[PDB]
């Protein structure tokens, strides 16, 4: 295979990594192993550190103006780079030793064991005026030759590489999702029953979502209008719970459920960023620097944790609202998993040279 590098501005340090993204199987995490080519000839600090952080950016403006990074350090970890710590002995991976033989002794390895239950690499839809580094959630590895950790990071003597970690749809389908409601009004005895069903718990980004919806209206009034909305519950946990809401797809049906009538219809909705660029700040999946990614993937968390993770939790739902002739509005809901197909390769995003 091939391996990526990034050369530090000073040329003394260089970093070599194998794959940009890391599969988050939740139960286990891909060990993030890389190497650093070091130049002791121009090195003078006599010590080098490499550290990996996961950080979520502070939201847009700070002190009534945007810019700069008050991002909270969700998790930071450090490791010695050169000279290697003799006390630190760990089993090198095959890629590590391959890079070592390709480069030599000036390449020094490092491994990071990302704990589970950490936020997925999620980005926030920037505004058209946002010229700084993108706001959202991401990991960043970085190297720098310094004697100790305290020292101010000197941009002439360091290097950084931003990275993302991804989850994927289970190959095992869950039970076929169902929901039902029975709304009754004070004006009538017989109930208004409504039911919605989705074919599968899982969908892939860019493929349709088909819902079978049935209605039974026996009340005196009549159902007049139908709102269908593929929506997204995104939970923000910078300080505490913050369930910020924005739907992604909608359609209006002028269909009618008559009194004492049954309605059986299939509705087809398929999200796409095109009609959602205007919805500023809409959650999206991870980005390298600014390349237009896809929509945010369904965050999957281990059930053992109590869902307190200090990060954005992304879950996609579909909302069906019926309106009755002139409280009358009725809503029913069905959640659905939303992740990519089975991975096989890297993310080769496509752009002009």
């Amino acid at each position, epitope marked *: 295979t091939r391996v990526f590098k990034k050369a530090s501005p000073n040329g003394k340090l260089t970093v070599y990594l194998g794959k940009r993204d890391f599969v988050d199987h939740i139960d286990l995490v891909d060990p993030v192993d890389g190497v650093v080519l070091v130049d002791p000839e121009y090195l003078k600090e006599r010590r080098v550190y490499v550290t990996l952080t996961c950080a979520f950016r502070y939201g847009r403006e700070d002190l009534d103006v945007l810019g700069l990074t008050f991002r909270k350090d969700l998790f930071v970890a450090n490791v010695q780079s050169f000279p290697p710590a003799p006390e630190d002995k760990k089993p090198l991976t095959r890629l590590q030793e391959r890079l070592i033989k390709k480069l030599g002794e000036h390449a020094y390895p490092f491994t990071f064991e990302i704990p589970p239950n950490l936020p997925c690499s999620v980005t926030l839809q920037p505004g058209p005026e946002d010229t700084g580094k993108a706001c959202g959630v991401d990991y960043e590895v970085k190297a720098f030759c310094a004697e100790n950790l305290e020292e101010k990071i000197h941009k002439r003597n360091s290097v950084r590489l931003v990275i993302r970690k991804v989850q994927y749809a289970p190959e095992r389908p869950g039970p076929q999702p169902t929901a039902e409601t029975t709304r009754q009004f004070l004006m009538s005895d017989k109930p208004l029953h409504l039911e919605a069903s989705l074919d599968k718990e899982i969908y892939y*980004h*860019g493929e349709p979502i088909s819902v079978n919806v049935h209605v039974t209206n026996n009340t005196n009034k009549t159902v007049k209008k139908i709102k269908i909305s593929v929506r997204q519950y995104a939970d923000i946990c910078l300080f505490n719970t913050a369930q910020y809401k924005c739907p992604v797809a909608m359609e209006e049906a002028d269909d009618t459920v008559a009194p004492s009538s049954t309605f059986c219809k299939v509705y087809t909705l398929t999200p796409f960023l*095109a009609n959602n660029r205007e919805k500023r700040g809409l959650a999206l999946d991870g980005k390298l620097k600014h390349e*237009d990614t896809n929509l945010a993937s369904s965050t999957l968390l281990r059930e053992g944790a109590n869902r307190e993770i200090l990060g954005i939790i992304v879950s996609y739902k579909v909302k069906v609202k019926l309106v009755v002739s002139r409280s009358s509005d009725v809503a029913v809901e069905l959640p659905f998993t939303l992740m990519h197909p089975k991975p096989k390769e890297e993310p*080769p*995003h496509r752009e002009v*040279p």
Partner: single-chain antibody
Amino acid sequence: GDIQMTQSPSSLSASVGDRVTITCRASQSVSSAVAWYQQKPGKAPKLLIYSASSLYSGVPSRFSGSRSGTDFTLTISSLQPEDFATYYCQQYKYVPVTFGCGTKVEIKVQLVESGGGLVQPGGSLRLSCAASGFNVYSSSIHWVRQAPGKCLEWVASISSYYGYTYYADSVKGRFTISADTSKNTAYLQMNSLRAEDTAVYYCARSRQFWYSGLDYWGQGTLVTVSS
């Protein structure tokens, strides 16, 4: 200048069950986003390799490929009678993407397309590709053209989910591309046609979630722009 590929082993014949070697040379650093297409003579292209290391589904394992820098090696352990056809190498990391002149070996899903035919120069003409069996939002849609004695060139691309349009340099603002999501069809209009537009046009369906080599093609339609 734009990135070029070059196909050296243009000529080869009278090979049965033997090692067949093909090289494609990349004019610039292109990493691994390279693919090889099989088109039977008078038929549609068929996907052989992508990334020069990933065999496509439904391909015999006897075909193989590899990358050596910007050079790319196609290997056949034992040639077969059905493999005497046209072979193409193409990078897919920078738009515009272009095919090299096909490598022909000589011996002694629904994608319907319509609209083409004969036309005078300096006009507009209509084509369309109705796609069935898959989902339009899950893929990008592309237009390639077959000019005999000329290297194959991609000319058009539409990204429904991203909602972007891409064209070759020689065709910028010269043709209109579109696609009805509902009808699941790609529409095409040729504004101000000239002699260079004479070719056989083929319909290619991407697979959006991550771009790779084109999987399925339409049989194409002839377009002869002449007085």
